[PDB]
Amino acid sequence: DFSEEQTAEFKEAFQLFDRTGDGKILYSQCGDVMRALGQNPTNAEVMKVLGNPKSDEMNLKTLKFEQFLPMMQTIAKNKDQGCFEDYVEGLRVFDKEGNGTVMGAEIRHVLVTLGEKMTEEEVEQLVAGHEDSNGCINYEELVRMVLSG
Amino acid sequence: PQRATSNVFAMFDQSQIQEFKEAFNMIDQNRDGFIDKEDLHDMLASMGKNPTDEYLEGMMSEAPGPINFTMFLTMFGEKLNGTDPEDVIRNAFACFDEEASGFIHEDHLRELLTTMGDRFTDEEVDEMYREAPIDKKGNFNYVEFTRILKHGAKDKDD
Amino acid sequence: NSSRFGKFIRINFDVTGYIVGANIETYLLEKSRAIRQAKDERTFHIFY
């Protein structure tokens, strides 16, 4: 582990996610905070973390700050690290004329054809951040923007 | 910390001490630079109706004997801390809701106030409800609230 | 109940993919219904 600076960051996030009692942590809350604190891989880690696919009780999904720390390490061992070459090739295959004339409709289609989907307000929210025109980007600007957090 | 205010209220603008010296001059009918039973019992009676309760002895007992100009200034100085003029509160109220119409819904108000930040009880928060005038249909205006929080406006008059 | 008039409804979308308006038109409202009626029918619903 690093010095106590990362423990201090986890503590201030702990007091930051103190709704409905500071002590108890929801797995949704811990997942959100760990993702935002510089760990992209969050999709299929629920089984790798809980050890139990039980996702029925939203009110009481038990987690404590003590065992939370090794969880962060066993996640941060970086089980997967992709780079933009695969992403851009997939999008250029998804692309139609090589420049991105009007990409707005088909990106929504491809994101609604995936089974593991959660949100639509984010789908309408992605227009922010240089994604303003009718799919004007050839995906390089948006890849650069997303790969900056 | 110590919170003794060793300096004479140095952590504030000095305009308020000209208003305070004007108030001191107008209360001091003896004009000796010191308050008195003779002073207040008639200057307070100028707008008041000769109150029977002996709370001016409350002042002269809060600070024993007749109080100096600087004593009055510092006993107000200990009363001001952790507060700022209306500009910053107005800007914050403009920030939290984009519309800036001051339509702070009662549910929204309680959610934004009692829940997050420094934890405190909604029961003591209710003093902002039973006393401060809240607008109808749940929303809560702030400009009048900011004015009454500052010296700009008062709920009633004597 | 008889749909005794032709109609054509045009719905307007946008390049973005959202509805923006509509336009309709009717063809040849049947007449001679107020004048003498066949057996066991009625002119129109408004009169009722």
Ligand SMILES: [Mg+2]
């Ligand atoms: Mg005097």
Ligand SMILES: [Mg+2]
């Ligand atoms: Mg018909």
